[PDB]
Design a protein around this ligand. Structure first.
Ligand SMILES: [Zn+2]
Lengths: 129, 101, 132, 216, 82, 218, 71, 24
RNA sequence: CAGAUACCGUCGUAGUUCCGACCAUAAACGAUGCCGACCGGCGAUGCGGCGGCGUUAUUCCCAUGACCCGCCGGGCAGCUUCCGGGAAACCAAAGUCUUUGGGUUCCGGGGGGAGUAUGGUUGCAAAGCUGAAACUUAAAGGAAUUGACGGAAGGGCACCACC
RNA sequence: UUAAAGUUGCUGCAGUUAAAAAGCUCGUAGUUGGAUCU
């Protein structure tokens, strides 16, 4: 069946990106997904999005700029120490100049960078660049 | 290397088809694969038409026609030249030959 | 079998293309014309080339020839092609139109046009060929 | 159009269109073209939305205009219904025509005598002549076209949604384009009805040549 | 792009497609720089001004170069609403 | 002596186009070798990567010809790669020099870390992909030199890439695929959209629309 | 495909060694039949006594007699 | 051909099953 | 037929058929595990539903059925395409793969030796399932490309082919 | 014996035709599991 909603979502927006479309319908949605897209959005990789509320599960409609190359998830969610982060981002990310690992932490959901500031570890979600 | 997309036979979405006996051969072939040629002609052929037409007790008596369904195993057809091989691209065309002028 | 060479047809083509005014429908005429106009060795070559100049021109008088573009014949086609009847075929006092066309016009606020006549829609729908 | 009252389509033109029947397309419809479609009536004939047509005409017009030297516009017609039309259009506009066989490798090949590097490309039908378009793919030519309700939009840039089948519709579309680009250039006027009749841009056929030459 | 001192170190700055934002290749020969003329609103004649568009090879093969051109024009106001 | 047969050519010979980047900006096809040759320069040198003989079989026997792989770099700005077949070796070689001079691409260069001096390496990690050969260039810390097999190393050297971590998977033996693939990599460098290029582009008058008047004269 | 779960671990390990027994090399090394059949016993060299001198015909495409010893 | 040496193998195996009997 | 214990032909046992117990193997093939998400069109078809002028089951009213024009959801497929793959043939899945992570099961590791030896196990039997090593060897193989050949299908020429 | 070996592959391979998907389905453990509560 469908598990890891996040994964499917990101596949969707990336596929709609490669094709070169303007908008996406990603369904269903979660708070996790939402905050995720938010973290992406603040850096500008995506844009502004609207949550259509339904009485079961929300649908998210997303506006796009071509700036997003790859958007991905890492399943399973890996427990990542502060020491370990380096190896990870050297593996996943295209350059040390840009791109972000998204981790869920006790502090909240955020960038690898923000967590290097807050001095916290956590579980890994995904990445984009 | 796969030769035909359809594997020479019409079989799709079903497991096994009833086997039939070749007209010429007696060689067993499944009905889907079997080359079928239907034959509608006249019992008596070209000249004996005008011949017998005169020997009748009836006026405007139309000659009966013979109807025969034929099955040929892949071999026999290529032998009788009912079917002949064609080029790689031209194979793809399943539109029947232009006997209609 | 008698058939003309590449050299024959190409030479006759270029010759007719350049000098077309000078040529005429007589063999000997264009023979003596080609002895001058171009430079050819021997004889049979010459005679053949001239012969195809002749034949080609016999074909010219009937109409346009695929291989040569003569001049002024782009201007002469500019003459022939330029034509017009006293009134345009686009001018009709009554043009018939379907109700739906009149609808699409009514969206464009042209539903007031005078020349129109609304014609009855055909009741059966068959636009398609009977597959088989 | 800039929605301006100047360029807004007058009724007379609408009459010319309704005459030449440019608003009637074939039974087949491409999912790219559905934007320009109005609605399908009975008898399977799709009806073209004419305002959109007009706007496309003007867009294409400004497109042609923007080129400085007029000879950088190439105008190509493969089939017969467009030959003369293309000829006259180029004659008035001062652009380089290709009528009849478009010699493949014209754009892409420096050694040929056919070689040219047009800035824009204008084409009668996408379906009939793919060749020039696929060349525009290689040489960076922006591409104008006349699309029926059924045409591929592949390698076309700004398309004009008319009937390219019947002779009249084609002649009229060409003539109108000429009128528009010319009234745009500053030559002629927005006031005076143009001297040249749309009928000049039509297609002969041998039957009409015989009729009108044997009428004299 | 820029080093610490702020200099622009680069050979050239490529142009992004107007429609899909993709970078247009150094050699992409299906690419389009289109020029659309600007009319004078009072007359209907030519200004000497134009709005330019850019479309990469990709969207041309999809044939959606057309629709993109169009809504681009709408966004610029060179096409009337409706 | 060189006679321009194209508008670009004439624009070049008449000094109306200042740099090469005016060409790469608009992605014009370059149909002549004397544009590239006029522009640069002594800066151009070239390598013979390989000469592979190939045979066609006829009723007569084996009729043999030659494929020349030629890599022509300008150290620090540009690379080119070309392949020519001919019955005679020399002809194939110089013909391939024309061929590789036709296809020349500029190479975008990045910083591995804090940005100081002039770029020593690729902007981000890119993938050239040709015919079962996957060549992957990754940015490397300053001074590590180029870590790779000889052949793509030649390219990356002439490209003016000082340091790169190269991975190559595939059947890497076949030369053509190797060269063309690593080449694909250094092609794709200016096709990669980083946040740097996120600015909206100010367009410019194309060399044809700007100089059209001077072109009408000739 | 492979099973990527967190708790999956033992599955992975087990199956990995089990496919590892299908590598000709590793099998040769860690089985121990190979060592047993070896006349050396894994030693680099072996001292021996000479029984006889033997000529040995070369393989097909090239012709020679190799001078060998039975030890 | 495959089918036949499979067959031959079964012949041989039957024969070996005869020549070595659990009585031996 | 040189030879045919073979292809051809006449005769003809077991079997082919039904009932009741075994056997568990096929090129059991879409040579493509299953669940799920996304990604271009286009006509067809099968089944149910929805809507729609108009024909028909004789002439008007509703049902209902037959065609006709669409829309929706499953299906078997087809055609089409610089979606992208791919060693290529080809594939809208074999796509979303060095920009490598949706869940899971089975499973391959150069070719032979060998699916053999042995033990174990199932069976009345034939066999099935599990399944080595010693040794041997630089290739075995897959797509496609020019050839040359074919007792293949087409054309074509010549009084050193015939009429 | 280690790297080369992305030829033991967790990071990271493969299984249409090259070595290879069980004949087919059920099924306990095992692994995996939709939204939602400052
Ligand atoms: Zn038969």
């Amino acid at each position: 069946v469908r598990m890891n909603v996040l994964a499917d979502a990101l596949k969707s927006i990336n596929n709609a990106e490669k094709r070169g479309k303007r908008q996406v319908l990603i369904r269903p949605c979660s708070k996790v997904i939402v905050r995720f897209l938010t973290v992406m959005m603040k850096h500008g990789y995506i844009g502004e999005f609207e949550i259509i509320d339904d009485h079961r599960a929300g649908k998210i409609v997303v506006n796009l700029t071509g700036r997003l190359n790859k958007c991905g998830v890492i399943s399973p969610r890996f427990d990542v120490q502060l020491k370990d982060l380096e190896k990870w981002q050297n593996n996943l990310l295209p350059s040390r100049q840009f791109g972000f690992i998204v981790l869920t932490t006790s502090a909240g959901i955020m960038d690898h960078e923000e967590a290097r500031r807050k001095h916290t570890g956590g579980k890994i979600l995904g990445f984009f660049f | 290397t796969k030769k035909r997309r359809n594997n020479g036979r019409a079989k799709k979405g079903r497991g096994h088809v009833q086997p039939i006996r070749c007209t010429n051969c007696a060689r067993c072939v499944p009905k889907d694969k079997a080359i079928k040629k239907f034959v509608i002609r006249n019992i008596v052929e070209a000249a004996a038409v005008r011949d017998i037409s005169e020997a009748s007790v009836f006026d405007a008596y139309v000659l009966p026609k013979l109807y025969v369904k034929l099955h040929y195993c892949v071999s026999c057809a290529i032998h009788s030249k009912v079917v002949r091989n064609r080029s790689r691209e031209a194979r793809k065309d399943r539109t029947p030959p232009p006997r209609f002028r | 079998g008698r058939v003309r060479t590449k050299t024959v047809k190409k030479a006759a083509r270029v010759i007719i293309e350049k000098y077309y005014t000078r040529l005429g429908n007589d063999f000997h005429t264009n023979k003596r014309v080609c002895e001058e106009i171009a430079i050819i060795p021997s004889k049979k070559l010459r005679n053949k080339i001239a012969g195809y100049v002749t034949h080609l021109m016999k074909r010219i008088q009937r109409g346009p020839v695929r291989g040569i573009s003569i001049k002024l014949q782009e201007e002469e086609r500019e003459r022939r092609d330029n034509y017009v009847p006293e009134v345009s075929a686009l001018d009709q006092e009554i043009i018939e139109v379907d109700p739906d066309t009149k609808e699409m016009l009514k969206l464009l606020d042209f539903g007031s046009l005078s020349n129109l006549q609304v014609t009855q829609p055909t009741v059966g729908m068959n636009f398609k060929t009977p597959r088989g | 159009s800039g929605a301006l009252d100047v360029l807004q389509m007058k009724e007379e033109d609408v009459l010319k269109f309704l005459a030449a029947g440019t608003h009637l397309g074939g039974t087949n419809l491409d999912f790219q073209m559905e934007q320009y479609i109005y609605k399908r009536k009975s008898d399977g004939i799709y009806i073209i939305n004419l305002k959109r047509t007009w706007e496309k005409l003007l867009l294409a017009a400004r497109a042609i205009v923007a080129i400085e030297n007029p000879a950088d516009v190439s105008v190509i017609s493969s089939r017969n219904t467009g030959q003369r039309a293309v000829l006259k259009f180029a004659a008035a506009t001062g652009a380089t025509p290709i009528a009849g066989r478009f010699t493949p490798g014209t754009f892409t090949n420096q050694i040929q005598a056919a070689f040219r590097e047009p800035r824009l490309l204008v084409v009668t039908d996408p379906r009939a002549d793919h060749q020039p378009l696929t060349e525009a793919s290689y040489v960076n030519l922006p591409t104008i076209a006349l699309c029926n309700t059924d045409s591929p939009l592949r390698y076309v840039d700004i398309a004009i949604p008319c009937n390219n089948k019947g002779a009249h519709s084609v002649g009229l579309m060409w003539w109108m384009l000429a009128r528009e680009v010319l009234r745009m250039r500053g030559t002629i006027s927005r006031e005076h009805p143009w001297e040249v009749m749309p009928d000049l841009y039509f297609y002969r056929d041998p039957e009409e040549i015989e009729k009108e030459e044997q009428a004299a | 792009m820029q080093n610490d001192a702020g200099e622009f170190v680069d050979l050239y700055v490529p142009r992004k497609c107007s429609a899909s934002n993709r970078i247009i290749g150094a050699k992409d020969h299906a690419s389009i720089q289109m020029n659309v003329a600007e009319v004078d609103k009072v007359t209907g004649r030519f200004n000497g001004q134009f709005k330019t568009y850019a479309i990469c090879g990709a969207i041309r093969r999809m044939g959606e170069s057309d629709d993109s051109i169009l809504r681009l024009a709408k966004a610029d106001g060179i096409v009337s609403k409706n | 002596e060189w006679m321009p047969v194209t508008k670009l050519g004439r624009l070049v010979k008449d000094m109306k186009i200042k740099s090469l980047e005016e060409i790469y900006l608009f992605s014009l096809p370059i149909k002549e070798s004397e544009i590239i040759d006029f522009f640069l320069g002594a800066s151009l040198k070239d390598e013979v990567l390989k000469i592979m003989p190939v045979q066609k079989q006829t009723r007569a026997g084996q009729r043999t010809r030659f494929k020349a792989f030629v890599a022509i770099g300008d150290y620090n700005g540009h690379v080119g790669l070309g392949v020519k077949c001919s019955k005679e070796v020399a002809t194939a070689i110089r013909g391939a020099i024309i061929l590789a001079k036709l296809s020349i691409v500029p190479v975008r260069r990045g910083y591995w870390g804090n940005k100081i001096g002039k770029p020593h390496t690729v902007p981000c990690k890119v993938t050239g992909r040709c015919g079962s050969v996957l060549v992957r260039l990754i940015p490397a810390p300053r001074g590590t030199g180029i870590v790779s097999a000889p052949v793509p190393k030649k390219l990356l050297m002439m490209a003016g890439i000082d340091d790169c971590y190269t991975s190559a998977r595939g059947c890497t033996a076949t030369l053509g695929n190797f060269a063309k693939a690593t080449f694909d990599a250094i092609s794709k460098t200016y096709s990669y959209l980083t946040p740097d290029l996120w600015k909206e582009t100010v367009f410019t008058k194309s060399p044809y629309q700007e100089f059209t008047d001077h072109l009408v004269k000739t | 495909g492979k099973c990527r779960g967190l708790r999956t671990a033992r599955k992975l390990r087990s199956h990995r060694r089990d496919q590892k027994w299908h590598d000709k090399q590793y099998k040769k090394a860690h089985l121990g039949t190979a060592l047993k059949a070896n006349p050396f016993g894994g030693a680099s060299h072996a001292k021996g006594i000479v029984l006889e001198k033997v000529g040995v015909e070369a393989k097909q495409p090239n012709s020679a007699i190799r001078k060998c010893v039975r030890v | 051909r495959a089918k036949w040496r499979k067959k031959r193998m079964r012949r041989l195996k039957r024969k070996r099953r005869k020549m070595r009997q659990r009585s031996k």
